[PDB]
């Protein structure tokens, strides 16, 4: 099934948001219960990002799938980047944001599309590993372009993140 996280709001001063997997799904119903009840597990992820923006809204969003997104565990809500709490242009690892495109990524340009999809295969140094104390994948959404809108209405654009597990395997029931 598809599990929808809490909706974040895009502002004109937002520095970006980041999430960790399967950390964000630890309390997401059946999948969270299974990952909590088993010592070892393996499952892929399908990431869908929806931007509820009108035709008069400006800006771009950069969704990056970073394996082993080490930062120099909020859960469902994740965290936000810091302008000067990881640094947005340093990508949380002292690396210029321009080179962050090496990871699998999608670009959400409000003038062309309002949604994007990503396929995240299982990535780890082991065939099977614990689903609780290890973060297999990380989702980072960055404001590649500042948010702007007509001086008519609205101030915050809602952003919906939906993650659906796939190829789920579980062993070591406890």
């Amino acid at each position: 099934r598809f599990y929808t996280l809490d909706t974040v709001t895009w502002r004109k001063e937002s520095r970006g948001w980041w999430w960790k997997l399967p950390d964000a799904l630890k309390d997401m119903g059946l999948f969270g219960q299974n990952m909590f009840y088993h010592y070892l597990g393996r499952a892929g992820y399908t990431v869908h990002v929806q931007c509820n923006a009108s035709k008069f809204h400006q800006g771009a969003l950069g969704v990056f799938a970073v394996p082993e997104m080490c930062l120099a565990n909020p859960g469902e809500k994740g965290g936000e980047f810091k302008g000067s709490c990881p640094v947005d242009y340093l990508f949380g690892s002292g690396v210029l944001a321009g080179n962050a495109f090496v990871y699998p990524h999608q670009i959400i340009n409000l003038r062309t599309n309002n949604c994007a999809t990503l396929v995240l295969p299982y990535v780890n140094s082991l065939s099977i590993d614990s689903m609780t104390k290890h973060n297999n994948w990380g989702i980072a959404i960055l404001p590649l372009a500042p948010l702007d809108f007509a001086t008519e209405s609205s101030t915050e654009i809602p952003i919906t993140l939906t993650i659906a597990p796939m190829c789920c395997e579980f062993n070591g029931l406890r």
Partner: protein, 199 residues
């Protein structure tokens, strides 16, 4: 794409100095007379190799170690000394680390060791993949940067000599059969510590 000299093997399999080991023989006189130092094998001591390896998340490679030993007479007029013999022992991961010159760890019951004679061609050993996982993990987000790799210890096995000698061992590590996975962007800030902290 295509073309040689740009492959992963060509990019990574290059010899470079990674460690310097200081050893003594006898007659401390006024110094601590360190007979061994022991060095944990890691790629964090060289910025170039560290940056090359940080380009990817998971990697597999074999390590070839070359040891160059240069001896020096501390006093020019101590007298001719007998030819020095050096013992270089590879400590596998999980094995005890030597703490004394004449402890049980130097008996080479299960620790590979090579004896080098001064004037001979430099010693060379090959260490295969000694990792516990299926690939070395340069990044780990959870509760793996210390990817084992064992350690190296060098000591002097010569008898008690009145003369004072100091020897320096240069360790060169050349990766072999390098395979990489999950490309990562290059580091853009100077390194501070063994982690990913930035200032």
């Amino acid at each position: 794409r295509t073309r040689s000299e740009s492959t992963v093997e060509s990019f990574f399999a290059r010899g470079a100095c990674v460690a310097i080991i200081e050893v003594d023989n006898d007659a401390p006189t006024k110094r601590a007379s360190k007979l061994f130092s022991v060095w944990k094998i890691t790629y964090k001591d060289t910025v170039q190799l560290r940056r090359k390896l940080e380009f990817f998340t998971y990697s597999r490679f074999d390590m070839e170690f070359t040891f160059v030993v240069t001896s020096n007479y501390t006093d020019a007029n101590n007298g001719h000394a007998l030819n020095q013999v050096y013992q270089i022992m590879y400590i596998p991961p999980g094995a005890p680390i030597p703490g004394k010159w004449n402890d049980y760890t130097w008996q080479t019951s299960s620790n590979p060791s090579v004896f080098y004679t001064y004037g001979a061609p430099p010693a060379r050993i090959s260490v295969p993949y000694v990792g516990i996982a299926n690939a070395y993990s340069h990044f780990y987000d959870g509760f793996a940067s210390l990817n084992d790799f064992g350690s190296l210890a060098v000591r002097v096995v010569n008898d008690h000599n009145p003369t004072k000698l100091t020897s320096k061992i240069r360790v060169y590590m050349k990766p072999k059969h390098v395979r990489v996975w999950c490309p990562r962007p290059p580091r853009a800030v100077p390194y501070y510590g063994p982690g990913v902290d930035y200032k």
